[PDB]
Amino acid sequence: QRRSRSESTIESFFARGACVAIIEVDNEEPTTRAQKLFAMWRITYKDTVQLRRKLEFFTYSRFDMELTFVVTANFTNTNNGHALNQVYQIMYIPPGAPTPKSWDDYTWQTSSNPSIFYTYGAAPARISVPYVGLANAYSHFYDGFAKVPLKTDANDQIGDSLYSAMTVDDFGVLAIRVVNDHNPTKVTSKVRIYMKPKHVRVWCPRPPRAVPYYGPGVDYKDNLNPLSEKGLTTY
């Protein structure tokens, strides 16, 4: 036979689970000072760089998503007894929905918002999501603004907006809490989120990133000397 290009397809190139978020949640006795009883994470893939760099090969994309959650817990001390198995609640809050202000407020009723209840020690949680883009395709790069200043504006701040930003709040957030009450001993936990694109279509290929990322945009600050030395007539 002859060599094939089965593994160079777009689907195969993105058929891997890539970490996109590490989130910390703690269980302990509530106190006046700041605590990590519940956490909120803004959904995106730009926190990490590997999946971001792989996706930025193209200007436009359209795909469904698969999310997997891995939870790891540990103690902090030894003289405050032990704890029983904990249950974690993960809730998806789309834009416009109320956001929690405490680990036990009414917002956790999740009457309409989807939620996942995970029991520690079981298999990592998993879900799937379809394409939820307002337009016909996701826009990795956007060359424009959300507002245009006008001569008749009273002040310059009316039309001021960040460059290369479509919407301030996009795709909602994920809120993670520990449903169990506090044991006499504090327990810390980390949730790792892994993302896998599926049914992927792409448009307008672009050259890959060559210098370290700096912010959500295309800005560069340091390490602008990627290539190394080599002789002109040296093999």
Binding site: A15, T59, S128, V218
Partner: protein, 263 residues
């Protein structure tokens, strides 16, 4: 066998346009500009035929030994060109393709090479520690365009930051090596073979129609791949000219005129 109902759960020469005439061409992605089809829309569009689809010539620039490059944004560069700009500012939604013609003439004793690149969603980097802090006025120079630089000059102002781009020639102003810029639609003008370049750009965007004021669909970048020289003269300068023709332009959402504040 698929169990869940939802699919997501499933496991994976002379060219004449209008009243203008110019005397090989490159078609981007092999797609000619076309109007919106009946199977994709969101009122009655306004589709000028000859009052806007014609060649407009921008200001000439000068290329010398120390020149590093130039860049323009579309449809920003044509915001003040005849009735095209009026229709752009009188309508909420606009759409159009482009034809770009770059002219530069020299003699047989000159030498040099220019690379012209058309980039969709061409985003440039800033000149400050703050991220995405560039202003609208600085990001839309107009027909004058901007220039590239060989080094990153961080802005030291703390009271009145400039809020301007700082493109770098060898990084293409976006953090990618220039050598790979040929992945985009491109043309090369070599003084020993040719003296002009032509490109045809269709409408590219995630939406069928979008606002022209707050979003730029295309970017044009011209860079000297080889330095200019002539005989043994110390200083050499030659003119470079750019002409742009809109094609298959549609407008919708008629209302009062928009008046952006450019400084």
């Amino acid at each position: 066998i698929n169990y869940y109902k939802d699919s997501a759960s499933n496991a994976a020469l002379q060219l004449t346009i209008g009243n203008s005439t110019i005397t090989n061409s490159v078609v981007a992605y092999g797609r000619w500009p076309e109007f919106i089809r009946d199977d994709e829309a969101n009122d009655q569009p306004t589709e000028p035929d000859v009052a806007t689809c014609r060649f407009y010539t921008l200001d000439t620039v000068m290329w010398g030994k120390e020149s590093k490059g130039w860049w323009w944004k579309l449809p920003d560069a044509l915001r003040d060109m005849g009735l095209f700009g009026q229709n752009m500012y009188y309508h909420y939604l606009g759409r159009s393709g482009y034809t770009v013609h770059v002219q530069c003439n020299a003699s047989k004793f000159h030498q040099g090479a220019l690379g012209v690149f058309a980039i969709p969603e061409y985003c440039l980097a800033g000149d400050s520690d703050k991220q995405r802090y560039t202003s609208y006025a600085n990001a839309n120079p107009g027909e004058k365009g901007g220039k590239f630089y060989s080094q990153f000059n961080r802005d030291t102002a703390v009271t009145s930051p400039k809020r301007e781009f700082c493109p770098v020639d060898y990084l293409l102003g976006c953090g990618v090596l220039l050598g790979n810029a040929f992945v985009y639609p491109h043309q090369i003008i070599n003084l020993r073979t040719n003296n002009s370049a032509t490109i045809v750009l269709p409408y590219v965007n995630a939406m069928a129609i979008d606002s022209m004021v707050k979003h730029n669909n295309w970017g044009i970048a011209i860079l000297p791949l080889s330095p200019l020289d002539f005989a043994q003269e110390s200083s050499v300068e030659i003119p470079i000219t750019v002409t742009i023709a809109p094609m298959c332009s549609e407008f919708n959402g008629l209302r009062n005129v928009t008046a952006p504040k450019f400084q």
